Design a protein around this ligand. Sequence first.
Ligand SMILES: CC(C)CCC[C@@H](C)[C@H]1CC[C@H]2[C@@H]3CC=C4C[C@@H](O)CC[C@]4(C)[C@H]3CC[C@]12C
Ligand SMILES: CC(C)CCC[C@@H](C)[C@H]1CC[C@H]2[C@@H]3CC=C4C[C@@H](O)CC[C@]4(C)[C@H]3CC[C@]12C
Ligand SMILES: *[C@@H]1O[C@H](CO)[C@@H](O)[C@H](O)[C@H]1NC(C)=O
Ligand SMILES: [K+]
Ligand SMILES: [K+]
Ligand SMILES: [K+]
Lengths: 46, 271, 271, 172
Amino acid sequence: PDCPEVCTCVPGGLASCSALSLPAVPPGLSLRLRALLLDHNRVRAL
Amino acid sequence: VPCDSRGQRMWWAFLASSMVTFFGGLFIILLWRTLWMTSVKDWAGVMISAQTLTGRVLVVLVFALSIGALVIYFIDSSNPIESCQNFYKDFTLQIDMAFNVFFLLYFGLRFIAANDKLWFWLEVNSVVDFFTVPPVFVSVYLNRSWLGLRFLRALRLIQFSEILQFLNILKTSNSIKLVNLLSIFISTWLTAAGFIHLVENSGDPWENFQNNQALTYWECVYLLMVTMSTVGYGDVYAKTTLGRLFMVFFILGGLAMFASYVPEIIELIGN
Amino acid sequence: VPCDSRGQRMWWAFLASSMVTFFGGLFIILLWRTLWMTSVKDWAGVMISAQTLTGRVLVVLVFALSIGALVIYFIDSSNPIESCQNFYKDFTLQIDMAFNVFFLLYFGLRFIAANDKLWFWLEVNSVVDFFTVPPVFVSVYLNRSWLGLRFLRALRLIQFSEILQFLNILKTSNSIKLVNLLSIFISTWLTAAGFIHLVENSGDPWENFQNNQALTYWECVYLLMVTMSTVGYGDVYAKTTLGRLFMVFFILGGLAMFASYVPEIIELIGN
Amino acid sequence: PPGAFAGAGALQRLDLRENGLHSVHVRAFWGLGALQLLDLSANQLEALAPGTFAPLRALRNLSLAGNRLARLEPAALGALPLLRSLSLQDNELAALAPGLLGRLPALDALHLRGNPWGCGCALRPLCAWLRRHPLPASEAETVLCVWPGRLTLSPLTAFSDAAFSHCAQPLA
Ligand SMILES: CC(C)CCC[C@@H](C)[C@H]1CC[C@H]2[C@@H]3CC=C4C[C@@H](O)CC[C@]4(C)[C@H]3CC[C@]12C
Ligand SMILES: CC(C)CCC[C@@H](C)[C@H]1CC[C@H]2[C@@H]3CC=C4C[C@@H](O)CC[C@]4(C)[C@H]3CC[C@]12C
Ligand SMILES: *[C@@H]1O[C@H](CO)[C@@H](O)[C@H](O)[C@H]1NC(C)=O
Ligand SMILES: [K+]
Ligand SMILES: [K+]
Ligand SMILES: [K+]
């Protein structure tokens, strides 16, 4: 649950999803992740 | 849990609650025609007579309550036409309920003091009672509310001149006639605007109410004033089929009424 | 450092500066009624009398200054309604100030020569003085400027026919009546256009003036002419609520005034 | 185009994602009812003509994720008895028409994550379906709805029959 399907996990609650072309937010959201990276993923709505 | 939604339209129940009063009781009166009463008839006649003090104060009271009901309708016209609400929670509905039960009691008292029941049943006051009073009972029973034909109480404004006459405010006949004409024009203007607003904001029934136009009551008043002066800017107009039919009928009726009332205008102008 | 900005609207101060003159002094006159003067009253009466030369030249002068003030308003109508300016820098404001202090002196001279102060206080000339003269003093004090009710000086066009009468230009009564009707129609047209322009370009107050429509004065004149002829193209119309209310009131008043003035038109046509 | 996949009458799998589809004509799947998987995700579809999925009969799992759909007409979906799973996540759906879920028997799997659901009387059939078919706990936590006028903290599955009590059933 702490690791998204397409993203990468780094200890310290770091999630990296750089350059994945995700249409929206990835489903891998958890309380452990203290840092989420959603740069250049072609998201258009929140 | 607390939410408000339109759901299914229930206007037909409210309309039928007045139709199955009016037409059914008219048929009952007709069939009765085909097939201490004098004392109580005289008592009711002297109760509502304009000569006595009781009749004067009572007609003043019913005029004031009609003004209050018109103000309540003006306030409530800024809401969705059909909406759910709690009768115990809101007390404005309680005020309208008290006004309407007073109207019902007055209608019964008038009906007792009627030499001809059938011709009393076709009066404008009787029909406005029929199309106003049962809807509030249906609304409080069903715990919902529909805007409906609650503007028709403005048709009691025609009595306004009479309200002045026995309070020693108008003496000459010319001023009384002028006030009567002004009150008639204002009342028919307001009720025509009420029908236009209802039929425009409600939408076409056979098209699943997808033709609704966001028109406020005062915008419809402005539209009626623009139309009756034969200006017709076209900034605001009726888009629904029934609204356009009502506009055509209102144009024809207003032209006919003005042509009929020209001689009274000339008499008021005088020489 | 040199910059111009609207900032906060100060129209209410200018309007109150006339309201707390008019209504407060009316109350003062009423309370005085509840609770060498003849010589000076006669002197002021003969000073402004139309028979003497002084009265003639003085009414010609005040008519000319009213024309000048109307021209100044026409020039200034092509500017933002509320704007900051320096009184010493611009001399057109100085010209308007001189015109308005002359109007104030004339109003005082008229007020001395008044048998009934209360009925003098309700004249159209008195009320146009009240709604014109204090605003320029408030503007020069606050170092700002508001367009306001400066078009009301067009209501002094009504005396135009009289201005001809004692200059040996009009002799017969028919021509005098025709000129009077034309002047009245032109003056009411111009002042109605002035109110429409002010209420349209100013915007709705309760909606933070976000309903302002860029309408020039001459476009509003065109709109009034189109409306009063019952044409109503709809290319230009009032979009604000108060503008629409004023348009409805103007339509009703114009129809009533035309219906009242029909017999004079027939008399001018004659046989 | 109509009859785009003509000649593939025995087709079973069909995947169209990341293509940016924006307009699908009605009756474009003439003879494609034999498919079981249909992926139309990651596109820009906004409206679906009624009867588009009518030729489909053997379809089991359908995905419409990541689209621009606002209103889903019941006539467009029709009745698909062999359907088992359906997805509408990451969309702009506000409410579902009542009786849409009752047309088809099997709707075991449903994903509605990320849709701006405005909880109301309209959503009550969906809440009743949640009572009949409970979602996974994680999916229940993720799927929420918007409460008008206040915060959207109310979960979709937290509602009960008390909220349905406000709705006026057809009068007897
Ligand atoms: C003269 C009066 C007393 C009786 C005449 C009946 C009139 C007022 C009735 C008959 C048909 C009615 C309409 C029928 C259908 C609808 C659609 C619904 O959204 C309610 C309003 C509306 C638009 C009704 C308004 C009132 C109506 C026009
Ligand atoms: C007959 C005259 C002398 C007195 C009547 C008062 C009239 C002229 C007053 C009363 C209310 C006033 C309006 C009230 C509010 C605003 C908004 C602001 O942007 C200034 C103009 C405007 C639109 C005012 C214009 C003048 C106004 C209409
Ligand atoms: C639907 O498709 C197949 C059935 O062939 C299944 O393996 C898959 O997991 C299903 N998809 C979802 C999202 O449940
Ligand atoms: K016209
Ligand atoms: K016309
Ligand atoms: K027109």
